[PDB]
Amino acid sequence: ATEYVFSDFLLKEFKGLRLELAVDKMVTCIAVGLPLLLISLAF
């Protein structure tokens, strides 16, 4: 006698899509950023 208990999970509703993986983004930021963070101290 509700007509409503369906409706809470009835409704269905992409710039928030990521492109790369998680740890692949880290091993690019570390393997490129750390040499350029130390060489810029040498300059």
Binding site: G33, L36, S40, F43
Partner: peptide
Amino acid sequence: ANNGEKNARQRLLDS
């Protein structure tokens, strides 16, 4: 902060 940081660090190393 990686597409923007690696594109900003690339030009400020050579200067």
